[PDB]
């Protein structure tokens, strides 16, 4: 399930990641940058 997002925008990255979490996926393939890497690591780590 493909979402297309502004990776530099942590709010948008949060929305995309959480939408995938909501859908109930086994894994998320994606990208981050300097500004959004902490969103990804914290959300991955918290939501498992």
């Amino acid at each position: 399930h493909i979402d297309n997002l502004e990776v530099a925008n942590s709010f948008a990255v949060t929305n995309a990641f959480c939408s995938q979490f909501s859908r109930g996926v086994y894994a998320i393939f994606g990208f981050y940058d300097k500004k959004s890497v902490n969103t990804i690591t914290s959300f991955c780590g918290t939501l498992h």
């Binding site: 709010f11 949060t14 929305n15 959480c18």
Partner: protein, 46 residues
Amino acid sequence: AILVIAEAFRYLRRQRVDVSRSAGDCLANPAVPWSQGIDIERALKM
């Protein structure tokens, strides 16, 4: 910081500029920020 926030809002009041918000969902898409936002920032920075 509290001195600066107090001063900024005392200024916005003096100038009869209003500010309402509501506010809602931070990930609302879009994604439209309130127009008072700019005035508050401006009030803070001046």
